Prior knowledge:
This protein has helices at 15-26, 32-35, 39-50, 88-107, 163-178, 222-241, 244-267, 271-289, 300-312, 347-366, 391-394, 397-404, 417-420, and strands spanning 55-63, 66-72, 77-81, 129-138, 141-150, 186-190, 321-324, 329-335, 338-341, 378-383, 408-414, 428-436, 439-444. It is of the alpha/beta class. Residues 64-65, 82, 84-90, 122-123, 383 line the site of adenosine-5'-triphosphate. The structure holds 2 DNA and RNA strands. This is AAA family ATPase. Keywords: ATP-binding, Nucleotide-binding. It comes from Escherichia coli O33.
Amino acid sequence: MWSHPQFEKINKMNLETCYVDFLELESHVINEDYLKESVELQKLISTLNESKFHLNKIGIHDFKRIRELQISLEDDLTVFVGDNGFGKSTILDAIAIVLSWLRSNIEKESKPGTYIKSHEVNNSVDVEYASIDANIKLKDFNTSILITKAKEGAYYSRNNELLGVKKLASIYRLVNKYVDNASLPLMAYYSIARSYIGGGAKTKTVWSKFDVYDEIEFDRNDFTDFFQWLVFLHNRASQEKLSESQTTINALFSDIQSLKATLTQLSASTVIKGLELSLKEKLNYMKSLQSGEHKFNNAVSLYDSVINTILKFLPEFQWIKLVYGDDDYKIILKKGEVELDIQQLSQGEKTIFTLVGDLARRLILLNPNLSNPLLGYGIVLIDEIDLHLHPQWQQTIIERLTSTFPNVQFVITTHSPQVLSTVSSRSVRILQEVEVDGVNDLIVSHP
DNA sequence: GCGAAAGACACAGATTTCTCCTTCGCATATAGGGATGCGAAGGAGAAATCTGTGTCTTTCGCAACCCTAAACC
RNA sequence: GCCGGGUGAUUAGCCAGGCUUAAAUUUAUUGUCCGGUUUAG
Ligand SMILES: Nc1ncnc2c1ncn2[C@@H]1O[C@H](COP(=O)(O)OP(=O)(O)OP(=O)(O)O)[C@@H](O)[C@H]1O
């Protein structure tokens, strides 16, 4: 996060070196026109784009029930299996704790995050403090972070390590400063308290990508904003459906009708030539513009993408519609041959509706430049995936989650043997309780 | 080890709104009188949301340094 | 078998292309003007 006389050493191509070369070039040139076209910025952007977010390893010492262990996480999927009271939620809490400081530093530097509560330290007599360590590896680049808290009543101090995460956050802020539509990583957490929001604002107008960074946890009001966001998309599509798109539509149907008329009357060149020429010319002219750059128009495509994505997980339904009533809007489904309502669904269908809708909203908001926003990077944590699901749905949820979002790392903890029948052996970790050296401890043995 | 300037953590309490609780007023299907059932407002008393204050965490461009080359702390 | 590490030797030489060898899931070369170590004047 500073400028240097560009120490040389051996030659390499690390992202850090490109970061410091751009900073060195910054202190000389003042005009922004040269800066926006310099080859150093192109090198930095190209290097940053091909890197894939990935948490490498984690270690927990003397936190809650866990005394000491180290875990290695896969880059696409990992599942923790155990019984009650075996510290399944402890690991997810530790990961969210270390991920909050990175979340905080992106919005503004030197901003605090989340600490350790005084009741989370172990209750043993011989303990003195608790610590958490982590590591993030983007391509060659490696960063580390340590969070620690001393037991209340002690007279010896311990502090945190925060140089790596501040250095990493500075790169993201610098890139965002010179790129119009730079993307950001995704971090989310679905705790066990998501069943309360199962169908239980001064005219919000401006939408930005920094509103999804308010919190790392999905809770309470996020459902309400989803509804407000969805109707905004619908109105945007309606505006695109009208105006000049209707003019070419007016020609096209008439040309088709004229061709149909030419087909009739015993085929009357002449009429056929005129109809064919007019149809070809109008269609070619309309298609040439293609609303600027085809998929660049978004509008209708995004709304259909989110609707079809939601309908992917509920095969028993037909369509979902938004209807304006006398004084409020409604969401109408159709199951079988009867129209339903969002408040007349079962608990299980509501859970899937909220989970998928929130995930799609976050992915769409954080990647405004990608043609298909559902291919972004990030990490998602889910606890007790088998809530309010019958065994038929328990065996196919996992492969669908990884099928729809193929570039997101997943961490999942489960409770039942139904899901274990559909997971590879390389991404299964089993917790156990054994006594070593006269002291009880927890181990993970399934590499 | 830690300047100034903003957040996190823990504990109160206050307040508007909603919801439970009398009191009687129709009503209507059984020829008037009596009975079971439900609708209408006051008047509670409960509960989610917000706001207040007091205790610590991070970590400075911090009177006061040498001018030959490489590595480590 | 695959991959990831070691490096003597070659090349208008921090390229490039050749020949060897090593293994539980298991390194990512760091602080000067002080300190001791190497060289030189
Ligand atoms: N401070 C503590 N000292 C000792 N043990 C603790 C402490 N805090 C929690 N525990 C232990 O944690 C155990 C439960 O841990 P945890 O909630 O992580 O497990 P889980 O049942 O797998 O999780 P979940 O049901 O929330 O998904 C309890 O049995 C308790 O003994």
